[PDB]
Amino acid sequence: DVYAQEKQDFVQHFSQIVRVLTEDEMGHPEIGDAIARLKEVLEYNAIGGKYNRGLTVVVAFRELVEPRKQDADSLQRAWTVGWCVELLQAFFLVADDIMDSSLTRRGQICWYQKPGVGLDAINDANLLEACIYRLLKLYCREQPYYLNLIELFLQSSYQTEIGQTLDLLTAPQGNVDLVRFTEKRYKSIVKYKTAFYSFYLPIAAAMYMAGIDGEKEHANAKKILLEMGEFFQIQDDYLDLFGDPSVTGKIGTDIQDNKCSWLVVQCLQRATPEQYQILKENYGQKEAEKVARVKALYEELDLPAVFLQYEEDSYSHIMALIEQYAAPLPPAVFLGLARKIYK
Amino acid sequence: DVYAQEKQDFVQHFSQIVRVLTEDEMGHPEIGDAIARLKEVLEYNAIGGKYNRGLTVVVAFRELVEPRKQDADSLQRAWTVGWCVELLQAFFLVADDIMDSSLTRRGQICWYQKPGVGLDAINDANLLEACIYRLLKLYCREQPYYLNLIELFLQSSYQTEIGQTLDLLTAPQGNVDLVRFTEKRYKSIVKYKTAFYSFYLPIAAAMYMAGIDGEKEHANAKKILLEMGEFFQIQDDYLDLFGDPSVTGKIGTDIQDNKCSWLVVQCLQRATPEQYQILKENYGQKEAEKVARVKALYEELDLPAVFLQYEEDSYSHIMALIEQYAAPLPPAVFLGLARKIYK
Ligand SMILES: O=C(O)[C@@H]1Cc2ccccc2N1C(=O)OCc1ccccc1
Ligand SMILES: O=C(O)[C@@H]1Cc2ccccc2N1C(=O)OCc1ccccc1
Ligand SMILES: O=P(O)(O)C(O)(Cn1ccnc1)P(=O)(O)O
Ligand SMILES: O=P(O)(O)C(O)(Cn1ccnc1)P(=O)(O)O
Ligand SMILES: [Mg+2]
Ligand SMILES: [Mg+2]
Ligand SMILES: [Mg+2]
Ligand SMILES: [Mg+2]
Ligand SMILES: [Mg+2]
Ligand SMILES: [Mg+2]
């Protein structure tokens, strides 16, 4: 619930973020048109979501930083670092949507699918990434955690890109080979493509801002955070096909994209020799009839009920990890995050 | 000539760079396939060029750093930073080729056009960028210029992306409006899209490694370097159409891509009302006949002779800037670079 009481101030900070990023134009009028494009990119791709990853930085900041140190400037920096996380997210999603041939995101047409944008979105994505470091220098350059944050964001990007590489390599277009969709491969993919930037990153950022830079403290937090991230991507895969379109704001493409989704992995582990053949002949193709066939097989194997059971077991597992690794950090930090991802 | 005597050791260092980047796999076997992809990306996109931008770092390093300080480890770091520049280059070119719809680069098919690669190249490009910061941390983390280099590379990337944004915004596909192709717009585009990363970056990196971090010294160097960069992009535009394919290693696409090329700008300034109409009806289109028409108009306006004259005048201008701004740096640093770009 701490997220709702911090959201407003966090979202209102976006205006300032845009202002500060588009104030590099006054000193260099010649790049005005580029700065205008940037503003359009930011407003279209950084706004429209729930902002939970960025909000996590803020929430954790206020729970880790002693009130007497939560001055106006410190809070400002916290809101900025939180937006940097949202920008990192935006950067990856713009590119991910092109690579996954997606149609919508956050209830609107994907940026690259917008008339007049197309592949220019690739550079737009690179600009969003660049903005992260511009804001860090502008707001935190004099802070003792400056270098830690720069390296954290850079490291998190590398891990995410390694993950994306695995994601794409395991899903060759027009090349269906179910044998590569194993539980071990799946866990490695999601750990790198989602767990680091969506969960470890936000909390780690707040920790560094709070002066908590101990390798041990970060390792223990990551123990909890990477497990939550795994659950989050599984839930993401589930929703890709069984989620309510009006709620997810995006059209699923995992089956058509031949992805190593939690669903197909669960399918292969429960499928009979016959069902296996059906999956093999209908997976990884654009034909709506073939996709529908795969979904029918998943429903026949009660995958939705399987996911619901996994969600409960996962929840209990994550809570167990919190009892073990939260200390010396306030359990609320992890509990609040968990409450946000589990229903 | 100092470039030829440093090339060998610089190129042989590539093996080590790859080794070090693919040694993050031993500790994390799960990302092996991703690391293998990375190696393939690096070998295909970081090797095959002249390596002059990276070599510039090395050459400048040995001319700025006192011999007694050019120890084995220091030289190693120099070769690494030089490769970081080549990787930054690779990152931008992989994406630039997709965005410019290019066919070949360095005498081979563009990475994204390789069968089986396609838009996955977007993430490959992001990985190359990430490698820069991984090498900087691995080789220079303990150096006093560490943060300076990190910020230099990040800043240079932002400037290049701003430039690319201008490049793309001024060249809307299927939307020909010659009125936007002005000399002022052209100079701003090339300053940001090429001058910073190809010329200021390499020299600035070597300066920081040599302990030269003065804002004044960097500003004076940039005065010379940004002007060389402008000349280099003009020459790049000239070669896009009039260059020897077997020498450039790439197929020109500026006319088809409706680009604000130095050529079209020079054309508009010398074109008669009639020639202007011919340009307008044939520019920015894929039809080989229409492209040929534009080239004929350029040859009719003696643009090739115009470029040759500009090259001589530019050379004299750059040399004049060196007499004025080289000090206290060795003039050879700039002269060597100039000898490399001017014939
Ligand atoms: O609702 C959304 O927009 C995303 C999609 C989703 C599906 C199920 C559960 C949570 C969420 N989300 C979400 O943001 O959850 C909160 C969160 C917090 C930190 C990191 C990732 C997600
Ligand atoms: O030959 C090449 O591969 C590129 C293409 C080219 C055309 C004309 C003149 C120089 C060059 N090059 C080049 O690398 O020149 C040297 C250089 C040095 C530092 C920064 C950029 C280019
Ligand atoms: O399913 P993906 O991994 O592509 C996704 O979750 C994005 N993503 C990319 C890396 N991590 C997550 P999205 O469904 O939002 O398209
Ligand atoms: O002409 P471009 O600017 O696209 C080019 O010079 C690449 N580039 C991109 C930014 N700076 C230079 P290339 O002709 O190598 O495709
Ligand atoms: Mg996706
Ligand atoms: Mg994806
Ligand atoms: Mg998904
Ligand atoms: Mg190009
Ligand atoms: Mg280009
Ligand atoms: Mg060119």
Instruction: Please answer yes or no on whether A158 and B30 come within 8 Å at the CB atom.
Output: no
First CA to last CA across chain A, in angstroms? 13
Asked, as a colleague might, if the bond just before A328 is cis with ω within 30 of 0, I would say yes
Q: What tokens does B187 get?
A: 């100079």
Q: What tokens does A297 get?
A: 């097989």
Tell me how far apart the alpha carbons of residues A262 and A162 are, in angstroms, rounded to a whole number.
Answer: 19
In order of A149, B3, B307, B316, the CA distances from B313 in angstroms are 47, 25, 10, 5
Q: Output b/e per residue, A40-66; b: 16+ Cβ within 10 A.
A: ebbebbbeebebbbbbbbbbbbbbbbe
Cα atoms found within 13 Å of the Cα of residue A87, Cβ hemisphere only = 29
Q: DSSP letters of A30-88? A: GGHHHHHHHHHHHHHHSSSS--HHHHHHHHHHHHHS-GGG--HHHHHHHHHHHHHHHHH
- Assess whether A254 carries a catalytic annotation: no
Going from the Cα of B112 to the center of ligand 2, the distance in angstroms, rounded, reads 23
Hunting for tokens 């090429």 — which residue is that?
A: B194
Going from the Cα of A16 to the center of ligand 6, the distance in angstroms, rounded, reads 30
Q: Which amino acid is at A275?
A: Q
Asked, as a colleague might, if the bond just before B144 is cis with ω within 30 of 0, I would say no
List CB contacts of B224: < 8 A, sequence separation 6 or more: B318, B321, B322, B325, B326, B334
Q: Is the dihedral of CA A114, A115, A119, A125 positive or negative?
A: negative
Tell me how far apart the alpha carbons of residues B32 and B44 are, in angstroms, rounded to a whole number.
Answer: 18
For B44, the enclosing helix (H) or strand (E) is: helix B32-45
Tell me how far apart the alpha carbons of residues A114 and B323 are, in angstroms, rounded to a whole number.
Answer: 50
What are the helix (H) ranges across A170-214?
183-190, 201-209
Q: What tokens does B288 get?
A: 């080989």
Tell me how far apart the alpha carbons of residues A317 and A223 are, in angstroms, rounded to a whole number.
Answer: 12
Is the CB of residue B199 less than 8 Å from the CB of residue B226? yes
Residue B106, helix vs strand vs coil:
coil
Contacts of B191 in chain A (CB under 8 A): 30
Residue A247, helix vs strand vs coil:
helix
Q: How many CB atoms lie within 10 A of CB A236?
A: 19
Q: How many CB atoms lie within 10 A of CB A16?
A: 13
Tell me how far apart the alpha carbons of residues B215 and B202 are, in angstroms, rounded to a whole number.
Answer: 16
Q: What tokens does A276 get?
A: 């296996």
Q: Which amino acid is at A6?
A: E
Cβ–ligand 3 contact at A124 (below 6 Å) = no
- Assess whether A236 carries a catalytic annotation: yes
Calculate Rg over the CA atoms of chain B: 21
Length of chain A: 343
Q: DSSP letters of B234-283? A: HHHHHHHHHS-HHHH-S---TTTTT---HHHHHHHHH--HHHHHHHHHHT
Q: Which amino acid is at B34?
A: A
For A109, the enclosing helix (H) or strand (E) is: strand A108-109
Experimental method reported for this structure: X-ray
For A264, the enclosing helix (H) or strand (E) is: helix A262-270
Chain A residues 117-156 within an 8 A CB cutoff of chain B: 118-120, 122-127, 130-131, 133-134, 137, 147, 150-151, 154
Ligand number nearest CA of B248 is 2
- Closest to A168 in 3D by CA, of A260, A93, A84: A260
Contacts of A253 in chain B (CB under 8 A): none
Tell me how far apart the alpha carbons of residues B232 and B238 are, in angstroms, rounded to a whole number.
Answer: 10
Tell me how far apart the alpha carbons of residues B80 and B77 are, in angstroms, rounded to a whole number.
Answer: 5
What domains are there in chain A, each with its CATH number? 1-343 (1.10.600.10)
Q: Which amino acid is at A256?
A: Q
Is the CB of residue A41 less than 8 Å from the CB of residue A47? no
Which residue, judged by its Cα, is nearest atom 4 of ligand 3? A96
Q: How many CB atoms lie within 10 A of CB A144?
A: 11
Tell me how far apart the alpha carbons of residues A41 and B162 are, in angstroms, rounded to a whole number.
Answer: 13
Tell me how far apart the alpha carbons of residues B18 and A89 are, in angstroms, rounded to a whole number.
Answer: 28
Tell me how far apart the alpha carbons of residues B334 and B340 are, in angstroms, rounded to a whole number.
Answer: 10
Cβ–ligand 2 contact at B341 (below 6 Å) = yes
Q: Output b/e per residue, A255-269; b: 16+ Cβ within 10 A.
A: bbbbbbbbbbbbbbe
Tell me how far apart the alpha carbons of residues B11 and A142 are, in angstroms, rounded to a whole number.
Answer: 38
